[PDB]
Structure 1
């Protein structure tokens, strides 16, 4: 609640100006180019980027999913479209029964002619197994009504149904849609627990059936729907190596890793609580804000707070110009030294999303002070890192800078002198795991099981990076090393 950071007085000062700006009604404006805002000072100057947890792509208050929110059982349509898909020609389901459109069962007969007959009757014309999308939607609407009708007609199903919330009702409709009224009623045990609100208890013994066994992926989506009562199971059906809704922790974790490695390319990021009318709040929070305690106001949202850096442009922008009109050797070397730090950071944390759009470059054209560098790099948008595992398809989530010509240059001695003494030291790696733990555990949805996997991947990255640095490998040869995890038994 209290954004205090004795370790970092400049950062705490920047946060204070953000709080003061909000009080004077200079609110952070939405970046929108979804859950990110340009935090400003009282003078209107942008001072940081803020990304609240509940507004992330998986966030419950994500403005992108709010449409889904109000509809609610009305989402059974889109829910079933995701589970059933669309096919304009007759096909066999998992049970081997003829089907068409959006999961519309035609018959249990092995005869394709009997199926075509049932189809012609349903559509009202000679289709020969082929229908249009509109015809599929019509049948789909009918099948949905029939599923609801079967529910409300049944004596065993109705009691469980009206006692359920809007979201959990769609889950029951889903089962009735797939198995029918008679079949779903056969789940006497699971139906009772659902009635008594015993969500976890029910989600367990629901997996104890041919339904789960026959179609596990579908069952898992529907069961978790019964468990959590949200639409999370249908938010991102591709497969994900990243944990659910912890992007802010990834943004902060990236800064933590960078600082301990002394990389200094990630603008300082930390977990910060902010309240702002410009943010997306629930209706219940909006109404209560105008109560009298001075008003109660809006609850401060938790999220990642990252300091804004000035003078930078897209890495794509600068790499573009450099490719055309190459930098002088001395400047290009400075650029390469920065690139190496970016490579080390992304590999250790395993950033899945680091295109030339996710890092910035600042190009500016006998003593006790070091002469200032002409070029500098900033690693931004580090919300999609610290994966639970290596991606099933590296092509889907690759290190994009690996395809850059800079990635072919061998690791300099300077980057070796900086990193090797740290990661090769098991005491350093242990403390790093500890710091990440204290940061990650703060999250309510924190899973100790997930964390051990995140660390196993990181330790696997450190293993390859250590040897790659010793062998003077380039970043490209580094990524080409077979990904591995160091798991504890």
Structure 2
């Protein structure tokens, strides 16, 4: 039926279902479905429920203006949410970037903080580090988010969607990180471990966790890690855990012009001088020294980063070339028993494919 009526009708059968698919693409996303992580999805529903019951997320007070504590219906904090459009450069949406170079000193893509934040968690899972609290790209609407004058007015009138859904403020895409309880700024503890040293067993545990922090921040080439930016939880009577929490400024697209800019602040710690353990070597080497893993990782990141209205395939290859070079350095340092300090001293490399 290459030129038949039967086929002409088959082609319209596809044309109308493909046009319906594209109409229902925004609502499908905003449904926040995670077949792969039912546990994360449940948290999101708790967040949605709380909002219907008018227990809203609240701005983090001394934080940057664009991040909120998501609460459950009981008032407990359950997540940190950071909307894309409330990021520093969350304006200038009409891609202007291609007119700009057809630059520059800046080495991060303009408005993809939430993606960096989500990418970190992704890298974490694939590497099995379990230090970044599960964070994913989520849509949420709430009175307390920063909307424009028009959005706020346009949302007064009663609106229904047609399965008769009420519509309020538009949902915001953002990163949604599981909230972890009882941690403090890493430096608070590290200086306390300077007066009281820890028992050796606990200290061995701290270092094991620290190595995972180092691996994560190095592969994603985090741009903004201080010693207040990662967290340690220690309860005396005896576990110690680190959480990597603020990962919105990673995945750069080139190494910084100056090597002095954007240091990894954990490199000045004494912990950084301790050679990589055997444990970290056989958790990480079987992975990063296999092209298929790195291929698979790169495809995963591609999937995640595609989401963005401003995604640029050119930029993405630059991002992956940087990360490839980081993986390469890490492999060597892992093989030759180097320490985190030696690792950060290796010269930046780019690997083009």
TM-score (norm 1): 0.62
Q: Deviation at 1:67?
A: 27
Distance 1:269-1:41 versus aligned 2 partners, 3 A rule: same
Distance 1:347-1:318 versus aligned 2 partners, 3 A rule: same
Distance 1:62-1:436 versus aligned 2 partners, 3 A rule: closer
Q: Deviation at 1:239?
A: 3.0
SS in 1 for 2:349: coil
Q: Does the Cα contact within 8 Å between 1:35 and 1:62 map onto a contact in 2?
A: no
CA distance in 2, matches of 1:242, 1:63: 18
CA distance in 1, matches of 2:303, 2:201: 41
Q: Does the Cα contact within 8 Å between 1:267 and 1:380 map onto a contact in 2?
A: yes
Instruction: Encode CA deviations 1:429-466: one digit per residue, 9 max, x unaligned.
Output: 00000000000011010000000000000000000000
Q: Does the Cα contact within 8 Å between 2:124 and 2:130 map onto a contact in 1?
A: yes
Distance 1:67-1:28 versus aligned 2 partners, 3 A rule: farther
Distance 1:299-1:236 versus aligned 2 partners, 3 A rule: farther
Q: Deviation at 1:47?
A: 0.3
Distance 1:50-1:10 versus aligned 2 partners, 3 A rule: same
CA distance in 1, matches of 2:93, 2:68: 13
Q: Deviation at 1:394?
A: 2.6
Distance 1:31-1:237 versus aligned 2 partners, 3 A rule: farther
SS in 2 for 1:485: strand
Instruction: Encode CA deviations 1:24-68: one digit per residue, 9 max, x unaligned.
Output: 110000003210000000101000000000001111299999999
Say how many residue pairs are matched.
314
Distance 1:67-1:362 versus aligned 2 partners, 3 A rule: farther
Instruction: Encode CA deviations 1:378-410: one digit per residue, 9 max, x unaligned.
Output: 000100000011111232211111111110000
SS in 1 for 2:69: strand
C-alpha root-mean-square deviation of aligned residues, in Å? 3.5
Q: Does the Cα contact within 8 Å between 2:95 and 2:310 map onto a contact in 1?
A: no
Instruction: Encode CA deviations 1:202-227: one digit per residue, 9 max, x unaligned.
Output: xxxxxxxxxxxxxxxxxxxxxxxxxx
2:328 counterpart of 1:299: no
| Structure 1, unaligned runs of 5 or more | 69-234, 366-372
Q: Does the Cα contact within 8 Å between 1:288 and 1:296 map onto a contact in 2?
A: no
Q: Which moved more, 1:386-395 or 1:262-271?
A: 386-395
Q: Does the Cα contact within 8 Å between 2:220 and 2:251 map onto a contact in 1?
A: yes
Q: Deviation at 1:236?
A: 20
CA distance in 2, matches of 1:12, 1:62: 29
Partner in structure 2 of residue 268 of structure 1: 134
Distance 1:236-1:276 versus aligned 2 partners, 3 A rule: farther
Q: Deviation at 1:290?
A: 1.1
Distance 1:304-1:236 versus aligned 2 partners, 3 A rule: farther
Q: Deviation at 1:484?
A: 0.3
Instruction: Encode CA deviations 1:155-203: one digit per residue, 9 max, x unaligned.
Output: xxxxxxxxxxxxxxxxxxxxxxxxxxxxxxxxxxxxxxxxxxxxxxxxx
Q: Does the Cα contact within 8 Å between 2:82 and 2:175 map onto a contact in 1?
A: yes
CA distance in 1, matches of 2:118, 2:225: 16
Q: Deviation at 1:320?
A: 1.0
SS in 1 for 2:190: helix
Q: Deviation at 1:247?
A: 0.3
Distance 1:320-1:46 versus aligned 2 partners, 3 A rule: same
Q: Deviation at 1:238?
A: 9.3
SS in 2 for 1:486: strand
Q: Which moved more, 1:355-364 or 1:390-399?
A: 390-399
CA distance in 1, matches of 2:97, 2:48: 27
| Structure 2, unaligned runs of 5 or more | 1-29, 159-164
Q: Does the Cα contact within 8 Å between 1:251 and 1:383 map onto a contact in 2?
A: yes
Higher relative contact order (CA 8 A, sep 6+): 2
SS in 2 for 1:273: strand
Instruction: Encode CA deviations 1:288-329: one digit per residue, 9 max, x unaligned.
Output: 11112x853100000000000001111010001001111111
Q: Deviation at 1:280?
A: 0.6
Q: Deviation at 1:237?
A: 11
Q: Does the Cα contact within 8 Å between 1:386 and 1:454 map onto a contact in 2?
A: yes
TM-score (norm 2): 0.85
SS in 2 for 1:250: helix
Relative to total residues, which structure has the larger helix share, 1 or 2? 1
Distance 1:472-1:67 versus aligned 2 partners, 3 A rule: closer
